[PDB]
Write a protein that binds this ligand. Structure first.
Ligand SMILES: CC(=O)N[C@H]1[C@H](OCCCO)OC(C(=O)O)=C[C@@H]1O
Length: 359
């Protein structure tokens, strides 16, 4: 597999199990915040890491529970971090669900009991505020038309528009017809730095967990998990409110079962931005994590062949652009589930290492 600057297990099954990673880079701090669900999904945990370029390594501090990221009598899941570069505030969106509830029970029961929450930190994640239940104000009446919903999982997005809008990728299971609820991706939008929220319009049916990135004029690309053999990709020219164009990207395979979550980010093109995406590449199972490059975003056909990042069992992942790397090329940080969900691995590499022919 691809030569990397670092490969370290940051979460391991012990007294608890860990899944659903989220990664967030704090530019001015040369540090990363790695989030995950601590399952018996009861709570969300976090580990802070300081990146030292001279040693090509990130030093990870002790794991800590995000105590405030929970509602009484509920399980917390789907950590979705975001850093507001204008207010200096760190956001951690997440979903809370009643304890007396499971997952399969959520998908179809026609009774939505899922809550949308957020906690903020003004000291780089050291301490957090009390949770804010955004459910009613951010969703509205539509709430009753869904069996359930979720955000991310994974890092969110802040646009370079006038308002420096906050965009939270998400999806809802909607009771459309004698069938089972059908999932459609969408984005929660805020133009006042998380003060108030609005629900964006749905993308094509049969799209789940997704992530968004901003490209160059201004377009928001959405990459979503689907129930088909390929990923679904959509574009928005109005900051996420509407995702007009939408299509299957055959080049980006989805494992047989129900597919698998993937990650996507934009980063400064070496030559304004290029995209990077990570997801299992095995056509019959969740294995062999691959990195894909799109140097002519968002063109679906411009997606490249995947480069092998890690062999073996691999699932969910999250990416973060970490600025300039040791070799002068774009540096990347990646967090992914591995070995039948026995751990979550941190991987750090550069564009030169992954796509030598494009740098
Ligand atoms: C909120 C929640 O239960 N998330 C699930 C997510 O659900 C997908 C929709 C299925 O119909 O899938 C998986 C998964 O490993 O495949 C892990 C997450 O923890």
């Amino acid at each position: 597999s691809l030569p990397v600057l670092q490969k370290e297990s940051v979460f391991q099954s012990g007294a608890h199990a860990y899944r659903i990673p989220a990664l967030l880079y704090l530019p001015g701090q040369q540090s990363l915040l790695a989030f995950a669900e601590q399952r018996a999904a009861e709570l969300i945990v976090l580990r802070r890491g300081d990146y030292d370029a001279p040693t090509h390594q990130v030093q990870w501090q002790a794991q800590e529970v995000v105590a405030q990221a929970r509602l009484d009598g509920h399980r917390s899941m789907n950590p979705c971090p975001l850093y507001d570069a204008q207010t200096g505030t760190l956001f951690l969106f997440f979903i809370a669900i009643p304890g007396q509830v499971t997952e399969q029970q959520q998908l179809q029961t026609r009774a939505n009991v899922t809550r949308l929450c957020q906690v903020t930190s003004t000291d780089h994640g050291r301490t957090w505020s009390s949770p804010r239940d955004l459910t009613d104000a951010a969703i509205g009446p539509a709430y009753r038309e869904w069996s359930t919903f979720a955000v991310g999982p994974g890092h969110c997005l802040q646009l370079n528009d006038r308002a420096r809008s906050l965009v939270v990728p998400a999806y809802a299971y909607r009771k459309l017809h004698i069938q089972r609820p059908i999932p459609s991706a969408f984005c929660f939008l805020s133009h006042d730095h998380g003060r108030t929220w609005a629900r964006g319009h749905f993308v094509a049916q049969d799209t789940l967990e997704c992530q968004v990135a901003e490209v160059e004029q201004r377009v928001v690309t959405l990459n979503a998990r689907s129930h088909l053999r390929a990923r679904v990709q959509a574009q928005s020219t109005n900051d996420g409110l509407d995702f007009q164009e939408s299509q299957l990207v055959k080049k980006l395979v989805e494992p047989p079962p129900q597919g698998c979550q993937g990650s996507v980010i934009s980063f400064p093109s070496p030559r304004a931005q290029w995209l990077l995406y990570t997801h299992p590449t095995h056509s019959w199972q969740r294995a062999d994590l691959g990195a894909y490059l799109n140097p002519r975003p968002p063109a679906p056909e411009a997606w490249s062949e995947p480069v092998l990042l890690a062999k073996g069992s691999c699932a969910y992942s999250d990416l973060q652009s970490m600025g300039t790397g040791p070799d002068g090329s774009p540096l990347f940080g990646c967090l992914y589930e591995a070995n039948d969900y026995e751990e979550i691995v941190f991987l750090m590499f550069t564009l030169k290492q992954a796509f030598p022919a494009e740098y």
